[PDB]
Paper text:
Retaining α-glucosidases employ a conserved two-step Koshland double displacement mechanism, in which α-glucosidase substrates are hydrolyzed using two key carboxylic acid residues functioning as the catalytic nucleophile (Asp518 in GAA and Asp412 in CjAgd31B, a bacterial homologue of GAA) and catalytic acid/base (Asp616 in GAA and Asp480 in CjAgd31B). Mutations in the gene encoding for GAA can lead to enzyme deficiency which generates multiple phenotypic forms of the lysosomal storage disorder (LSD) Pompe disease (PD). Herein, we report a 1,6-epi-cyclophellitol cyclosulfamidate as a new class of reversible α-glucosidase inhibitors that displays enzyme inhibitory activity by virtue of its conformational mimicry of the substrate when bound in the Michaelis complex.
Crystallographic studies with the proteolytically digested form of human recombinant rhGAA (Myozyme)21 and the bacterial GH31 α-glucosidase/transglucosidase CjAgd31B homologue from Cellvibrio japonicus(30) further demonstrated the binding motifs of cyclosulfamidates 4 and 6.
Residue numbers in the entry: 35 to 137, 141 to 817
């Protein structure tokens, strides 16, 4: 039984008093509101908000039974008696409190009938998590396959078919009930922590995600090398083995940007060395020479690190002396049993912990380490009586990884202000993307079910802020012999998801260079394709940094008024133009692709398909996976390089997918030096735009470049433009008003500037794209 008593306005923030206490309402933007219950009392700070202490001017109007607090898009309607807040985008009801807040911490809201609810971060439950209840407690799920209620990286957040996102801004051991217990109730619980939620509205899924990333954090553009080929396993045992792997990528002609060193870099055994955080010199005798030798070949070194310092490690005594470890209530260092041994957890919430850990990262980065892998940040084992500077284990648990990322991100920016940190981690919180967190889906089984779950996991994490969510390609856990077909399908899918990092337990090779001739002959041209496609992928990365638009988009983005599409987890968009359907079972001979209505081309074969709603049936082969290109797409390629350190766009090849059904189409290619963290803010980039205008008698391309450029930017790019499904009735090309004849023979066999291949329905234009505007006009 709860009721309104009065309200003030203080710094654009509404402070409401009920019978039970104070509620602080602050607009973080015009479409996002923070609702802090128990506002009177000392709580943990926000973790989800990029700017916790922000509140923009809202308007307040007062009636007899209700207040109205509006930002411009988002309206909080406060019913006085009984006390209940609901949320409106204009006059459309998004979300209404039931009993709202109670006591342990509890929040209760109504679900509308037919409302579909994405969220919870990593679960394998189905895209619509409505009818599910699960804990908010980051925890390992070793060897998962086709089902999980609880994994490495949960998020206390949901996305509704009503186009809101709700964040439970609380770090503690908790739970989410998505109308499981009570078919029309959503309930958020925690054992402790902050009594706060955040509602975000949008007019569309893309503007919802832009609004969400606006207030929770935009991922800084990663270094372009994060889009490259990683050599990884658990684990290279020696410097000799690591050098032999880099050498194997060279001799097998696979692209390689980065080699990842697992826990053998700091000890000879899995158990008992964790916390050493320094080279095992018996097995890595000349690590500085090793990293420098790799850097000469354009190869970066990434080292694993973990929160745990074992009592058996060389750094136990020094960590205890520095007060770097979390304490028991008696005030000693807390020691407990991990799989790896007996040890403590570095307290990243403490000054002493942060400074001690930071110092070690700084020392190893100076030796040549380019990037960082932070594993076990759930934290994997976190006994409930462990004490951090700001709270107990159960209170801070789901933010440990978040703060570890912040600490490491701030540290890397202070050491290398002109470089973009690479931080790969297993667990974080809402907003962790603002610290450049790159998550992976942990210890997936080497099974088809493990592969078949990855699109679901990726989309659930992408939708709520994590564009660079990826899997251990080929699978991680157990198996005794390679499942070749599964491995091949997994590394094909890998080309079309965020981070190309095969990784697995080393009794079976994870790296493609160690596979049989057939496997290499399939994957080598696809790993080259990934590099040739860097202008496509890096542009999707740029859009992610700008608007939070994830690199992987769900099928349901294609039709926002068809909620039945929300359940789809077998087909997704890789950037704007590619609809990818991974093969996630053995011997699949054909697939049914629920392609949105319109025109689509086979990415591999150029075949044109039209549909008015009916799915498309494509045959499958071992050498590819089904990929359709949207009519009106501009697909940009550069020549393949071994390493992004050698990346050049001196030579562009752009494939435009023409169809009269798309009278207007736009593309963009974002180019910068691939390394400057300030390139976007300081406009030190080359943004290429392409516009196609397709009428009955003409096809007109407008090309332009904006931005201030960057050092090494080519003034003039040799451009081959390949027009797919081109009309056979084009006679004449104008380039900037100068008329050129279109050749109709020997296109592949002359230095033709415009040539039509009648057999392939491809019109090839070869020209110079310099700094000035270029118009290409084809006419019948
Ligand atoms: O519990 S594990 O076996 N799984 C953890 C990570 O998830 C793996 O990626 C990594 O290779 C392992 C070795 O450092 C870690 O130990
Ligand atoms: O697309 C066209 O305009 C054609 O086919 O001639």
């Amino acid at each position: 039984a709860v009721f309104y008593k009065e309200h003030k306005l203080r710094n654009d923030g509404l402070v409401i008093t009920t019978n039970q206490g104070n509620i602080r309402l602050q607009f973080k933007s015009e479409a996002a509101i923070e609702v802090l219950y128990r506002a009177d009392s000392k709580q943990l700070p926000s973790f989800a908000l990029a700017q916790p202490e922000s509140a923009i001017k809202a308007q307040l109007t007062e009636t007899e039974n209700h207040l109205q607090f509006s930002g411009g898009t988002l309206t909080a309607r406060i019913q006085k008696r009984p006390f209940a807040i609901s949320y409106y985008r204009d006059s459309e009801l998004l979300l209404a409190e039931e009993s709202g807040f109670q006591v342990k911490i509890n929040f209760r809201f109504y679900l509308s009938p037919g409302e579909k609810i994405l969220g919870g971060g990593q679960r394998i439950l189905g895209m619509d998590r409505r009818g599910q209840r699960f804990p908010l407690y980051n925890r390992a799920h070793y060897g998962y396959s086709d089902h999980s209620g609880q994994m490495y990286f949960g998020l206390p957040a949901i996305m509704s078919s009503k186009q809101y996102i709700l964040v439970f801004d609380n770090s503690a051991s908790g739970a989410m009930d998505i109308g499981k217990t009570e078919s029309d109730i959503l309930q958020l619980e925690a054992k402790s922590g902050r009594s706060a939620y955040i509602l975000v509205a949008g007019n569309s899924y893309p503007s919802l995600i832009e609004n969400f990333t606006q207030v929770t954090g935009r991922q800084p553009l990663p270094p372009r090398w994060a889009l490259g080929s990683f050599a990884s396993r658990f684990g290279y045992r020696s410097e000799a083995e690591t050098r032999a792997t880099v050498q194997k990528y060279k001799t097998e002609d696979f692209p390689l940007d980065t080699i990842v060193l697992d826990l053998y870099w700091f000890g000879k055994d899995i158990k008992g060395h964790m916390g050493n955080l320094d080279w095992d010199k018996e097995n890595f005798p000349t690590p500085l020479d090793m990293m420098a030798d790799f850097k000469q070949q354009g190869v970066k070194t990434v080292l694993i690190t973990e929160p745990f310092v074992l009592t058996s490690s060389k750094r136990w005594d020094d960590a205890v002396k520095a007060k770097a470890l979390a304490k028991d209530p008696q005030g000693q260092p807390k020691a407990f049993e991990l799989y790896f041994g007996n040890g403590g957890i570095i307290d990243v919430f403490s000054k002493e912990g942060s400074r001690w850990f930071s110092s070690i990262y700084k020392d190893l980065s100076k030796q040549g380490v380019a990037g960082w892998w932070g594993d076990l940040g759930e934290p994997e084992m976190h006994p409930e009586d462990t004490q951090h500077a700001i709270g107990d284990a159960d209170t801070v648990h789901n933010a440990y990884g978040h703060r570890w990322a912040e600490m490491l991100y701030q540290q890397q920016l202070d050491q290398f202000p002109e470089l973009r940190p690479f931080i790969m981690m297993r667990a974080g919180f809402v907003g962790s993307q603002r610290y450049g967190m790159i998550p992976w889906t942990g210890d997936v089984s080497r099974t088809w079910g493990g592969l078949a779950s990855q699109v679901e996991l990726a989309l659930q994490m992408s939708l709520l802020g994590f564009g660079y969510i990826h899997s251990d390609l080929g699978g991680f856990a157990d198996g005794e012999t390679l499942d070749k077909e599964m491995y091949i399908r997994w590394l094909q899918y890998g080309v079309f998801q965020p981070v190309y990092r095969p990784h697995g337990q080393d009794h079976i090779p994870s790296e493609p260079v160690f596979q049989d001739e057939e496997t290499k002959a399939i994957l080598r041209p696809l790993v080259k394709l990934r590099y040739r496609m860097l202008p496509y992928i890096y542009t999707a990365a740029y859009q992610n940094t700008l608007t939070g638009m994830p690199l992987m988009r769900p099928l349901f983005f294609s039709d926002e008024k068809n909620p039945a599409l929300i359940d789809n987890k077998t087909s997704y968009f890789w950037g704007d133009s590619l609809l990818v359907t991974p093969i996630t079972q053995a011997g699949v001979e054909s697939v049914s692709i629920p392609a949105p209505k319109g025109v689509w081309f086979d990415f591999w074969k150029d075949t044109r398909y039209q549909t008015d709603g009916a799915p498309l049936t494509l045959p499958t082969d071992l050498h590819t996976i089904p990929v359709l290109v949207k009519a009106g797409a501009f697909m940009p390629y550069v020549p393949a390089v071994s390493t992004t350190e050698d990346y050049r766009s001196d030579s562009l090849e752009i494939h435009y997918y023409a169809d009269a059904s798309v009278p207007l189409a736009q593309g963009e290619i974002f180019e910068d030096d691939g390394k400057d963290p300030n390139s976007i803010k300081r406009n030190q980039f080359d943004l290429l735009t392409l516009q196609a205008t397709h009428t009955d008698n003409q096809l007109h391309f407008q090309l332009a470049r904006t931005g201030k450029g960057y050092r090494g930017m080519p003034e003039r790019r040799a451009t081959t433009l390949v027009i797919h499904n081109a009309s056979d009735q084009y006679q004449h090309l104008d380039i900037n008003g100068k008329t050129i004849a279109i050749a109709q023979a020997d296109c592949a066999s002359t230095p033709a500037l415009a040539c039509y291949d009648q057999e392939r329905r491809q019109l090839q234009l070869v020209f110079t794209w310099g700094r000035e505007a270029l118009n290409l006009r084809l006419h019948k």
